[PDB]
Coordinates of C-alpha atoms in Angstrom, one line a residue:
Chain A
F1 CA -11.9 -22.0 -19.8
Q2 CA -10.1 -20.3 -16.9
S3 CA -10.0 -16.6 -15.9
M4 CA -7.9 -15.5 -12.9
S5 CA -9.1 -12.6 -10.9
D6 CA -6.5 -11.0 -8.6
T7 CA -7.4 -8.3 -6.2
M8 CA -6.2 -6.6 -3.0
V9 CA -7.4 -8.5 0.0
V10 CA -5.1 -10.9 2.1
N11 CA -7.7 -13.1 3.7
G12 CA -5.7 -16.0 5.2
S13 CA -2.7 -17.9 6.4
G14 CA -0.6 -17.9 3.3
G15 CA 1.8 -15.3 4.6
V16 CA 1.2 -12.5 2.0
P17 CA 2.3 -9.3 3.7
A18 CA -0.4 -6.6 4.5
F19 CA 0.1 -3.1 3.3
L20 CA 3.6 -3.8 2.1
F21 CA 3.9 -0.4 0.5
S22 CA 2.0 1.7 2.9
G23 CA 3.4 4.2 5.4
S24 CA 7.0 5.7 5.3
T25 CA 10.5 4.5 5.9
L26 CA 13.0 6.4 7.9
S27 CA 16.4 5.8 6.4
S28 CA 19.8 7.4 7.2
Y29 CA 21.1 5.9 3.9
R30 CA 20.2 6.8 0.4
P31 CA 20.3 4.2 -2.5
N32 CA 20.9 6.3 -5.8
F33 CA 20.2 3.8 -8.7
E34 CA 18.7 5.4 -11.8
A35 CA 17.7 8.8 -13.0
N36 CA 14.3 7.8 -14.4
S37 CA 11.7 8.3 -11.7
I38 CA 9.2 5.8 -13.1
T39 CA 11.4 2.7 -12.6
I40 CA 11.2 2.7 -8.8
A41 CA 8.1 0.7 -9.6
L42 CA 10.8 -1.9 -10.7
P43 CA 12.9 -4.1 -8.4
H44 CA 16.3 -2.8 -7.5
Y45 CA 18.8 -4.7 -5.5
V46 CA 21.6 -3.3 -3.3
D47 CA 24.0 -4.4 -0.5
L48 CA 23.8 -2.4 2.7
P49 CA 27.3 -0.8 3.1
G50 CA 29.7 -2.4 5.4
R51 CA 27.3 -5.2 6.2
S52 CA 27.1 -8.9 5.1
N53 CA 24.1 -11.1 4.4
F54 CA 22.0 -7.8 4.0
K55 CA 21.0 -7.4 0.4
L56 CA 17.9 -5.2 0.1
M57 CA 15.3 -5.1 -2.7
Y58 CA 14.0 -1.5 -3.4
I59 CA 10.5 -1.3 -4.9
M60 CA 8.1 1.8 -4.9
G61 CA 11.1 3.4 -3.1
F62 CA 10.8 1.2 -0.1
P63 CA 13.5 -1.2 1.1
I64 CA 12.4 -4.8 1.5
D65 CA 14.6 -7.4 3.3
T66 CA 14.2 -10.9 2.0
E67 CA 15.5 -14.2 3.4
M68 CA 15.5 -17.7 2.0
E69 CA 16.4 -21.2 3.1
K70 CA 17.2 -22.5 -0.3
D71 CA 20.3 -20.9 -1.8
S72 CA 19.3 -17.7 -3.8
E73 CA 20.7 -14.9 -5.8
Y74 CA 18.6 -11.8 -4.6
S75 CA 17.6 -13.3 -1.2
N76 CA 19.5 -13.2 2.1
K77 CA 20.4 -16.4 4.1
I78 CA 18.3 -17.0 7.1
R79 CA 19.2 -14.9 10.0
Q80 CA 19.6 -16.4 13.6
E81 CA 17.6 -15.1 16.4
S82 CA 19.1 -13.1 19.2
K83 CA 19.3 -14.1 22.9
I84 CA 17.9 -10.7 24.0
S85 CA 14.4 -11.3 25.1
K86 CA 11.5 -9.3 23.7
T87 CA 9.8 -9.1 27.0
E88 CA 12.9 -8.0 28.9
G89 CA 16.3 -7.0 27.8
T90 CA 17.4 -4.0 25.8
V91 CA 19.6 -2.8 23.0
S92 CA 22.5 -0.4 23.7
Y93 CA 22.3 3.3 23.0
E94 CA 25.3 3.6 20.6
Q95 CA 24.2 0.8 18.3
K96 CA 22.1 1.5 15.2
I97 CA 19.1 -0.8 14.6
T98 CA 16.9 -1.8 11.7
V99 CA 13.2 -2.1 12.4
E100 CA 11.2 -4.3 10.0
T101 CA 7.5 -5.5 9.5
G102 CA 6.3 -8.5 7.5
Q103 CA 6.0 -12.3 7.3
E104 CA 7.7 -15.6 7.2
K105 CA 6.6 -19.2 6.3
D106 CA 8.3 -22.4 5.1
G107 CA 11.7 -20.9 5.1
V108 CA 11.0 -17.7 3.2
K109 CA 11.1 -14.4 4.7
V110 CA 9.7 -11.0 3.4
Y111 CA 10.1 -7.9 5.5
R112 CA 9.4 -4.3 4.9
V113 CA 12.1 -2.1 6.3
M114 CA 10.6 0.7 8.3
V115 CA 13.8 2.0 9.8
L116 CA 17.1 1.5 8.1
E117 CA 20.2 1.7 10.3
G118 CA 18.7 4.4 12.7
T119 CA 19.0 5.2 16.4
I120 CA 16.7 3.8 19.0
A121 CA 15.3 7.4 19.6
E122 CA 14.6 8.0 16.0
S123 CA 12.9 4.6 15.5
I124 CA 10.6 5.4 18.6
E125 CA 9.4 8.6 16.9
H126 CA 9.1 6.9 13.6
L127 CA 7.0 3.8 14.6
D128 CA 4.7 6.2 16.6
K129 CA 3.6 7.9 13.3
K130 CA 0.0 7.5 12.4
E131 CA 0.6 6.8 8.7
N132 CA 2.6 3.8 9.8
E133 CA 0.0 2.3 12.2
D134 CA -1.6 0.2 9.5
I135 CA 1.6 -1.8 8.4
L136 CA 2.9 -2.2 12.0
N137 CA -0.4 -3.6 13.2
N138 CA -1.0 -6.3 10.6
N139 CA 2.4 -7.9 10.3
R140 CA 5.2 -9.4 12.4
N141 CA 7.6 -6.8 13.7
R142 CA 11.2 -7.5 14.2
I143 CA 14.5 -5.7 14.8
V144 CA 17.6 -6.6 13.0
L145 CA 20.7 -5.9 15.2
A146 CA 24.0 -4.7 14.3
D147 CA 25.4 -8.3 14.4
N148 CA 22.7 -9.2 11.9
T149 CA 20.9 -11.3 14.5
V150 CA 17.2 -10.8 14.9
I151 CA 14.6 -10.1 17.8
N152 CA 11.1 -11.0 16.9
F153 CA 8.2 -9.3 18.8
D154 CA 4.7 -10.6 19.5
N155 CA 3.2 -7.3 18.6
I156 CA 4.0 -3.6 17.7
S157 CA 3.3 -2.3 21.2
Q158 CA 5.8 -4.8 22.7
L159 CA 8.5 -3.5 20.3
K160 CA 8.0 0.2 20.9
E161 CA 7.8 -0.3 24.7
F162 CA 11.0 -2.5 24.4
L163 CA 12.5 0.6 22.7
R164 CA 11.0 3.0 25.3
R165 CA 13.1 0.9 27.7
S166 CA 16.2 1.0 25.6
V167 CA 16.4 4.7 25.8
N168 CA 15.2 5.1 29.3
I169 CA 17.9 3.1 31.1
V170 CA 20.6 5.5 29.8
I171 CA 19.0 8.5 31.4
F172 CA 18.7 6.3 34.6
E173 CA 22.3 5.4 34.7
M174 CA 23.5 8.9 34.0
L175 CA 21.2 10.3 36.7
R176 CA 22.3 7.5 39.1
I177 CA 25.8 9.0 39.1
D178 CA 24.8 12.6 39.2
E179 CA 22.0 12.4 41.8
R180 CA 22.3 8.9 43.5
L181 CA 20.1 6.0 43.7
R182 CA 18.6 5.5 47.3
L183 CA 16.6 2.3 47.9
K184 CA 15.6 3.3 51.4
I185 CA 13.8 6.6 52.3
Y186 CA 16.2 9.3 53.2
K187 CA 15.7 13.0 54.4
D188 CA 17.6 15.5 52.2
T189 CA 19.3 18.9 52.8
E190 CA 16.1 20.9 53.2
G191 CA 14.4 18.2 55.2
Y192 CA 12.1 16.6 52.6
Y193 CA 11.7 12.8 52.5
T194 CA 13.0 11.3 49.2
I195 CA 13.6 7.9 47.6
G196 CA 15.0 6.4 44.5
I197 CA 16.6 9.1 42.3
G198 CA 15.5 12.3 43.8
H199 CA 11.8 11.4 44.1
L200 CA 10.0 13.7 46.5
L201 CA 7.4 11.8 48.6
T202 CA 5.7 14.4 50.6
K203 CA 5.7 18.0 51.8
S204 CA 5.2 16.7 55.3
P205 CA 7.9 16.6 58.1
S206 CA 6.5 13.1 59.2
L207 CA 8.4 10.1 58.2
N208 CA 5.2 8.2 58.6
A209 CA 3.5 10.4 56.1
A210 CA 6.4 9.7 53.7
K211 CA 6.2 6.0 54.3
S212 CA 2.6 6.2 53.6
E213 CA 3.0 8.2 50.4
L214 CA 5.7 5.7 49.2
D215 CA 3.2 2.9 49.7
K216 CA 0.6 4.9 47.8
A217 CA 3.0 5.4 45.0
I218 CA 4.3 1.8 44.7
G219 CA 1.0 0.2 45.5
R220 CA 2.1 -2.2 48.2
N221 CA 3.2 -2.2 51.8
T222 CA 6.9 -1.1 51.3
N223 CA 8.1 -0.3 55.0
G224 CA 10.3 2.4 53.6
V225 CA 12.3 0.2 51.2
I226 CA 11.9 -0.4 47.4
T227 CA 13.7 -2.6 44.8
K228 CA 15.9 -1.4 42.0
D229 CA 13.2 -2.1 39.7
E230 CA 10.4 0.0 41.4
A231 CA 13.0 2.8 41.7
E232 CA 13.4 2.6 37.9
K233 CA 9.7 2.8 37.4
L234 CA 9.4 6.0 39.6
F235 CA 12.3 7.4 37.6
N236 CA 10.7 6.7 34.3
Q237 CA 7.5 8.3 35.4
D238 CA 9.5 11.4 36.6
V239 CA 11.3 11.5 33.3
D240 CA 8.0 11.4 31.4
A241 CA 6.7 14.4 33.5
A242 CA 10.0 16.2 32.9
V243 CA 9.6 15.9 29.1
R244 CA 5.9 16.9 29.5
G245 CA 7.0 20.2 31.1
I246 CA 9.7 20.8 28.5
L247 CA 7.0 20.8 25.9
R248 CA 4.9 23.3 27.8
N249 CA 7.9 25.6 27.8
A250 CA 8.3 28.1 25.1
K251 CA 12.2 28.2 25.3
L252 CA 12.9 24.7 26.1
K253 CA 10.6 22.8 23.7
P254 CA 12.2 24.3 20.6
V255 CA 15.8 23.4 21.6
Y256 CA 14.3 20.0 22.8
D257 CA 13.2 18.3 19.6
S258 CA 16.2 19.8 17.7
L259 CA 18.7 17.7 19.6
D260 CA 19.5 14.0 19.5
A261 CA 18.1 12.0 22.5
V262 CA 21.5 12.1 24.1
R263 CA 21.6 15.8 24.4
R264 CA 17.8 15.7 25.1
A265 CA 18.9 13.8 28.2
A266 CA 21.5 16.3 29.2
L267 CA 18.6 18.8 29.3
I268 CA 16.5 16.4 31.4
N269 CA 19.5 16.1 33.6
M270 CA 19.4 19.9 34.4
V271 CA 15.6 19.8 34.8
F272 CA 16.0 17.3 37.6
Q273 CA 18.6 19.5 39.1
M274 CA 17.3 23.1 39.1
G275 CA 13.7 22.6 38.1
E276 CA 12.1 23.4 34.8
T277 CA 12.0 27.2 35.1
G278 CA 15.5 27.3 36.5
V279 CA 16.8 25.5 33.4
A280 CA 14.4 27.6 31.3
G281 CA 16.1 30.8 32.6
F282 CA 19.3 29.7 30.9
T283 CA 18.3 31.4 27.7
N284 CA 21.5 32.3 25.8
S285 CA 23.1 28.9 26.1
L286 CA 20.0 27.0 24.6
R287 CA 20.2 29.0 21.3
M288 CA 23.8 28.1 20.7
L289 CA 22.8 24.4 21.1
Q290 CA 20.0 24.9 18.7
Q291 CA 22.5 26.2 16.1
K292 CA 24.6 23.1 16.8
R293 CA 27.7 25.0 18.0
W294 CA 28.7 22.7 20.8
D295 CA 32.1 24.1 21.6
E296 CA 30.6 27.6 22.1
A297 CA 27.5 26.6 24.1
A298 CA 29.7 24.5 26.4
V299 CA 31.8 27.6 26.9
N300 CA 28.7 29.7 27.9
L301 CA 27.3 27.0 30.2
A302 CA 30.5 27.1 32.2
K303 CA 30.0 30.7 32.8
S304 CA 27.4 30.0 35.6
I305 CA 26.7 29.6 39.3
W306 CA 25.6 26.1 38.3
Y307 CA 29.1 25.2 37.0
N308 CA 30.3 26.8 40.2
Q309 CA 28.0 25.1 42.7
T310 CA 28.4 21.7 41.1
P311 CA 31.7 21.5 39.1
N312 CA 32.0 17.8 38.4
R313 CA 28.3 17.3 37.5
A314 CA 28.2 20.4 35.2
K315 CA 31.3 19.1 33.3
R316 CA 29.7 15.8 32.6
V317 CA 26.5 17.5 31.2
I318 CA 28.6 20.1 29.4
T319 CA 30.8 17.3 27.8
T320 CA 27.5 15.5 26.9
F321 CA 26.5 18.7 25.1
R322 CA 29.8 18.7 23.2
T323 CA 30.0 15.2 21.9
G324 CA 26.4 14.0 21.6
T325 CA 27.3 10.7 23.2
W326 CA 27.6 9.4 26.8
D327 CA 31.3 9.8 26.8
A328 CA 31.4 11.8 30.0
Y329 CA 29.9 8.8 31.9
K330 CA 32.4 6.0 32.4
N331 CA 33.4 3.9 35.4
Chain B
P1 CA 2.1 5.6 -11.6
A2 CA -0.9 6.5 -9.4
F3 CA -2.7 3.5 -7.7
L4 CA -0.2 1.1 -9.5
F5 CA -1.1 -1.7 -7.1
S6 CA -4.8 -1.0 -6.6
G7 CA -8.1 -2.6 -8.0
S8 CA -8.0 -5.9 -9.7
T9 CA -6.6 -7.8 -12.7
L10 CA -8.3 -10.3 -15.0
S11 CA -6.1 -12.9 -16.7
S12 CA -6.5 -15.9 -19.0
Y13 CA -2.8 -16.8 -18.3
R14 CA -1.9 -19.1 -15.4
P15 CA 1.6 -18.4 -14.1
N16 CA 4.2 -21.1 -13.3
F17 CA 4.4 -20.2 -9.6
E18 CA 2.2 -20.4 -6.5
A19 CA -0.5 -18.0 -5.9
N20 CA -1.8 -16.6 -2.6
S21 CA 1.5 -17.2 -0.8
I22 CA 4.3 -15.1 0.8
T23 CA 6.0 -16.2 -2.4
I24 CA 4.3 -13.6 -4.6
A25 CA 6.0 -10.8 -2.7
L26 CA 9.3 -11.6 -4.5
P27 CA 9.3 -10.8 -8.2
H28 CA 8.6 -13.4 -10.8
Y29 CA 9.4 -12.9 -14.4
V30 CA 7.5 -14.9 -17.0
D31 CA 7.8 -15.0 -20.7
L32 CA 4.2 -15.1 -22.0
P33 CA 3.7 -18.3 -24.1
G34 CA 3.3 -18.0 -27.8
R35 CA 4.0 -14.2 -27.6
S36 CA 7.3 -12.7 -28.9
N37 CA 8.5 -9.5 -27.0
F38 CA 6.1 -10.2 -24.1
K39 CA 8.0 -10.5 -20.8
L40 CA 6.0 -9.7 -17.7
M41 CA 7.0 -9.1 -14.1
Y42 CA 4.6 -10.3 -11.3
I43 CA 4.7 -8.6 -8.0
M44 CA 2.1 -8.9 -5.2
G45 CA -0.2 -10.7 -7.6
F46 CA -0.1 -8.1 -10.3
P47 CA 1.6 -8.2 -13.7
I48 CA 3.6 -5.2 -14.7
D49 CA 4.5 -4.6 -18.3
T50 CA 7.7 -2.6 -19.2
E51 CA 9.2 -1.2 -22.4
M52 CA 12.6 0.4 -22.7
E53 CA 14.6 1.3 -25.8
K54 CA 17.6 0.3 -23.9
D55 CA 18.6 -3.5 -23.9
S56 CA 17.4 -5.1 -20.7
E57 CA 17.2 -8.5 -19.0
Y58 CA 13.6 -8.3 -17.8
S59 CA 12.0 -5.7 -20.2
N60 CA 10.4 -5.5 -23.5
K61 CA 11.6 -3.7 -26.6
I62 CA 9.5 -0.5 -27.5
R63 CA 6.3 -1.6 -29.1
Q64 CA 5.0 -0.5 -32.3
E65 CA 1.9 1.8 -32.3
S66 CA -1.2 0.4 -34.1
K67 CA -2.6 2.2 -37.1
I68 CA -6.2 1.6 -35.8
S69 CA -8.1 4.8 -34.9
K70 CA -8.6 5.3 -31.3
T71 CA -11.6 7.3 -31.9
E72 CA -13.7 5.3 -34.5
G73 CA -11.7 2.1 -35.2
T74 CA -12.4 -1.4 -33.8
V75 CA -10.5 -4.6 -33.0
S76 CA -12.1 -7.9 -34.2
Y77 CA -14.2 -9.3 -31.5
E78 CA -12.7 -12.8 -32.2
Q79 CA -9.4 -11.6 -30.8
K80 CA -8.1 -11.5 -27.1
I81 CA -6.7 -8.3 -25.9
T82 CA -4.5 -7.0 -23.2
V83 CA -5.5 -3.8 -21.4
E84 CA -3.0 -1.8 -19.6
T85 CA -2.7 1.4 -17.7
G86 CA 0.4 3.4 -16.5
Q87 CA 3.0 6.1 -17.4
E88 CA 5.7 6.9 -20.0
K89 CA 8.7 9.0 -19.5
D90 CA 12.0 9.5 -21.5
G91 CA 11.8 6.2 -23.5
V92 CA 10.8 4.1 -20.6
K93 CA 7.2 2.7 -20.2
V94 CA 5.7 1.2 -17.0
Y95 CA 2.2 -0.3 -17.4
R96 CA 0.2 -2.3 -14.8
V97 CA -1.8 -5.0 -16.7
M98 CA -5.6 -4.8 -15.9
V99 CA -6.7 -7.4 -18.5
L100 CA -4.3 -10.1 -19.6
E101 CA -5.4 -11.7 -23.0
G102 CA -9.1 -11.4 -22.2
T103 CA -12.1 -11.3 -24.6
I104 CA -13.6 -8.0 -25.5
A105 CA -16.8 -8.7 -23.4
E106 CA -14.5 -9.7 -20.4
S107 CA -12.5 -6.5 -20.7
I108 CA -15.6 -4.2 -20.8
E109 CA -17.1 -5.8 -17.6
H110 CA -13.7 -5.7 -15.8
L111 CA -12.9 -2.0 -16.6
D112 CA -16.3 -1.1 -15.2
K113 CA -15.5 -2.5 -11.7
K114 CA -15.4 0.5 -9.2
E115 CA -12.3 -0.9 -7.6
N116 CA -10.6 0.1 -10.9
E117 CA -11.9 3.7 -11.3
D118 CA -9.1 5.5 -9.6
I119 CA -6.3 3.8 -11.5
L120 CA -8.0 4.0 -14.9
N121 CA -8.8 7.7 -14.4
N122 CA -5.4 8.6 -13.3
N123 CA -2.9 7.0 -15.7
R124 CA -2.6 6.3 -19.5
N125 CA -4.8 3.5 -20.9
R126 CA -3.7 1.4 -23.8
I127 CA -4.7 -2.0 -25.4
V128 CA -1.8 -4.4 -26.4
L129 CA -3.1 -6.2 -29.4
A130 CA -2.8 -9.9 -30.3
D131 CA 0.0 -8.9 -32.8
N132 CA 1.9 -7.0 -30.2
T133 CA 1.1 -3.5 -31.5
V134 CA -0.6 -1.0 -29.2
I135 CA -3.5 1.6 -29.3
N136 CA -2.9 4.3 -26.7
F137 CA -6.2 6.0 -25.5
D138 CA -6.6 9.7 -24.7
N139 CA -8.7 8.7 -21.6
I140 CA -10.3 5.6 -20.3
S141 CA -13.9 6.6 -21.5
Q142 CA -12.6 6.6 -25.1
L143 CA -11.2 3.1 -24.5
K144 CA -14.6 2.0 -23.1
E145 CA -16.4 3.4 -26.1
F146 CA -13.8 1.6 -28.4
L147 CA -14.4 -1.8 -26.8
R148 CA -18.1 -1.3 -26.7
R149 CA -17.9 -0.3 -30.5
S150 CA -16.0 -3.5 -31.1
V151 CA -18.6 -5.9 -29.5
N152 CA -21.5 -4.2 -31.1
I153 CA -20.3 -4.5 -34.6
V154 CA -22.9 -7.2 -35.4
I155 CA -25.9 -5.8 -33.3
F156 CA -25.3 -2.5 -34.9
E157 CA -25.7 -3.7 -38.4
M158 CA -28.7 -5.7 -37.3
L159 CA -30.6 -2.8 -35.7
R160 CA -29.6 -0.3 -38.4
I161 CA -31.5 -2.6 -40.8
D162 CA -34.5 -3.1 -38.6
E163 CA -34.8 0.5 -37.2
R164 CA -32.6 2.5 -39.6
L165 CA -29.7 5.0 -38.9
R166 CA -31.2 8.4 -38.9
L167 CA -29.1 11.4 -38.3
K168 CA -31.9 14.1 -38.4
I169 CA -34.7 13.8 -36.0
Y170 CA -37.6 11.6 -37.2
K171 CA -40.9 10.6 -35.5
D172 CA -41.3 7.2 -33.9
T173 CA -44.5 5.1 -34.3
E174 CA -46.0 6.2 -31.0
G175 CA -45.5 10.0 -31.2
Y176 CA -42.2 9.8 -29.6
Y177 CA -39.2 11.9 -30.9
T178 CA -36.5 9.5 -32.2
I179 CA -33.0 9.9 -33.4
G180 CA -30.0 7.6 -34.3
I181 CA -30.9 3.9 -34.2
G182 CA -34.4 3.7 -32.5
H183 CA -33.1 6.2 -30.0
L184 CA -35.7 8.3 -28.2
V185 CA -28.9 16.4 -36.6
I186 CA -25.8 14.3 -35.6
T187 CA -23.0 12.4 -37.2
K188 CA -22.8 8.6 -37.7
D189 CA -20.2 8.6 -34.9
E190 CA -22.6 10.6 -32.6
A191 CA -25.2 8.1 -33.3
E192 CA -22.9 5.0 -32.7
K193 CA -22.2 6.3 -29.3
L194 CA -26.0 6.8 -28.5
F195 CA -26.4 3.2 -29.8
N196 CA -23.8 1.8 -27.5
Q197 CA -25.5 3.7 -24.7
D198 CA -28.8 2.1 -25.6
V199 CA -27.4 -1.4 -25.9
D200 CA -26.1 -0.9 -22.5
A201 CA -29.6 0.2 -21.3
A202 CA -31.3 -2.8 -23.0
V203 CA -28.8 -5.3 -21.4
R204 CA -29.1 -3.5 -18.0
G205 CA -32.9 -3.5 -18.2
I206 CA -32.9 -7.2 -19.3
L207 CA -30.7 -8.4 -16.4
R208 CA -32.9 -6.3 -13.9
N209 CA -35.9 -8.2 -15.3
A210 CA -36.7 -11.5 -13.6
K211 CA -38.1 -13.2 -16.7
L212 CA -35.3 -12.3 -19.1
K213 CA -32.1 -12.4 -17.1
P214 CA -32.1 -16.3 -16.8
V215 CA -33.0 -16.9 -20.5
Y216 CA -30.4 -14.5 -21.5
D217 CA -27.6 -16.2 -19.7
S218 CA -28.3 -19.4 -21.6
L219 CA -27.8 -17.7 -24.9
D220 CA -24.6 -17.3 -27.1
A221 CA -23.7 -13.7 -28.4
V222 CA -25.8 -14.1 -31.5
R223 CA -29.1 -15.2 -29.9
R224 CA -28.5 -12.5 -27.4
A225 CA -28.6 -10.0 -30.3
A226 CA -32.0 -11.4 -31.3
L227 CA -33.2 -10.8 -27.9
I228 CA -31.8 -7.3 -27.5
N229 CA -33.4 -6.7 -31.0
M230 CA -36.9 -7.6 -29.6
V231 CA -36.5 -5.3 -26.6
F232 CA -35.5 -2.4 -28.9
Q233 CA -38.9 -3.0 -30.7
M234 CA -41.3 -3.6 -27.9
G235 CA -39.5 -3.1 -24.6
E236 CA -38.5 -5.4 -21.7
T237 CA -42.1 -5.9 -20.6
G238 CA -43.3 -7.0 -24.0
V239 CA -40.5 -9.4 -24.6
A240 CA -40.9 -10.9 -21.2
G241 CA -44.6 -11.7 -22.0
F242 CA -43.4 -14.3 -24.5
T243 CA -43.4 -16.9 -21.8
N244 CA -44.0 -20.0 -24.1
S245 CA -41.3 -19.2 -26.7
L246 CA -39.2 -17.6 -24.1
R247 CA -38.8 -20.9 -22.0
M248 CA -37.8 -22.9 -25.1
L249 CA -34.5 -20.9 -25.2
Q250 CA -33.9 -21.6 -21.5
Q251 CA -34.1 -25.3 -22.4
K252 CA -31.9 -24.5 -25.5
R253 CA -34.5 -25.9 -27.8
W254 CA -34.9 -23.9 -31.0
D255 CA -37.2 -24.6 -34.0
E256 CA -40.0 -25.3 -31.5
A257 CA -39.4 -21.6 -30.7
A258 CA -39.1 -20.5 -34.4
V259 CA -42.8 -21.2 -34.8
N260 CA -44.1 -20.4 -31.4
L261 CA -42.7 -16.8 -32.3
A262 CA -44.7 -16.9 -35.6
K263 CA -47.7 -17.6 -33.4
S264 CA -47.5 -14.2 -32.0
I265 CA -49.3 -10.9 -32.9
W266 CA -45.8 -9.7 -33.1
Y267 CA -44.9 -11.7 -36.2
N268 CA -48.2 -10.6 -37.8
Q269 CA -47.6 -6.9 -37.0
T270 CA -44.0 -6.7 -38.4
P271 CA -43.4 -9.9 -40.4
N272 CA -40.1 -8.9 -42.1
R273 CA -38.3 -7.9 -39.0
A274 CA -39.8 -10.7 -37.0
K275 CA -38.8 -13.5 -39.6
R276 CA -35.2 -12.2 -39.5
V277 CA -35.1 -12.0 -35.7
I278 CA -36.7 -15.5 -35.4
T279 CA -34.3 -16.9 -38.0
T280 CA -31.4 -15.4 -36.0
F281 CA -32.8 -17.1 -33.0
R282 CA -33.2 -20.4 -34.9
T283 CA -29.7 -20.7 -36.5
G284 CA -27.8 -18.8 -33.9
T285 CA -26.1 -17.1 -36.8
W286 CA -26.4 -13.9 -38.8
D287 CA -27.5 -15.4 -42.2
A288 CA -30.8 -13.6 -42.0
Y289 CA -29.1 -10.1 -42.0
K290 CA -26.1 -10.5 -44.3
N291 CA -27.7 -8.6 -47.3

């Protein structure tokens, strides 16, 4: 006679998903269903609010997104792929996104939702969690865009670095307006050679020393000129160091992680302007931001030499601290 | 339910959908053949059993509890059982199936897999019987002891005849202090547990012995009892020294063994027990003991 033994392992190319109920899911939307705790072990189907072709199946409290070629009752229709590349291209800041991990074969798709309708910043933090490392490393990782098209990534690292790019362009564009992008070396007000977006090259008065330091930074013979793309890299590196210093700061680090990445960037904006301890010495204005009283914090920030010395820039940053969007930057 | 999708399941049922595919990540509902009130839901290769008082599309009606004692009752060894583990809250039952319509012997071996320790230790264990009633067990050890008591029904009667069920401490025929059933005051229950333990021992000792393990695999449950019986009397090493007769079972030829056992000093030293065991070996039945 015949005994079936079913265990845990997933040893081959059948497309069974690995660690389907591991890790955690970040969701900005709660399901409800039933009052009995012990039936989340049972399948619960629900449509995602305001969407189409986006039925979810909840099980063990996790959302699973499911697609089928053959017409189905509980499965979604197959989603088309986006024309946004995985290697380059980005998704815009004001769109939510859904991050998934899982499998597909012969017109059947089963994907564990890791991030349900969250921001790019939130997803970046979420996928970086250690508990999630197992499910993201042994499955196919994709992003389901707002328009319900899909971007498939070759690996988790490619996705998160895609997302790293998606957030970082915005701080670049913003800072381009406030500080200027310079693709040739230029000597600034005090007499320091600079390039890109406010990147100091050297503490030496020699242009040659600057041209040499720029070469050292880019890793080629530049002759004092760089491309928009290299400038962006230098910027990203500078951003990363600015966030570094914000964490080593006792007054900035707290108000930092308590803001949405848009406001976090408004802080980075000041850091680029008046240095880390200058911004640090604002004190009273930070606490009002922490408390999420934007209209009041904006009023205190205006009461400053900074608002006085740079009116137009200070308004854009302050309006960015009111409405946690990039509304202040247009045209 | 802790570890709900951990360990392994043994099943005598073959589902009507593809195994080992992405396909199993979607739920499948089967209505177990021949069984009334026995809907199951498969997910990720595991069957989940559910009871709700409320009327439902993919659930079972609340199952009646069996009147069989969880502490000293048995289920007939001729019957398949289902073994489940899980939780109950507010009229709703969620049980992961560990053994689906398996024999008692199959269940005992499967519930001993270390991969299953965590889940049997941390949820409620119950047997769903052939007639759809259930025995709920206080803890998994009690279940294990229940099963063990159900397969040993026969070997117990055999050895209680040959070696006697003694409650108060008596002296074995070698100076050894012996209680229960040839075990080196208590109640008949306390003895039965010791016996289960000593049957475990003998079987473990038999497998671990090079000479006995192969000849033991080529035996049906009844002839196994005969072999276990011999080990209870003389030990693994003594039994294993019966190479002549011993090989005749590994060639499945009896009768030629029934007399090549009476050749022994063993037969001459304890003729009554030995004729019985020999007869048991010959017929592969219990007709030597049923009196």
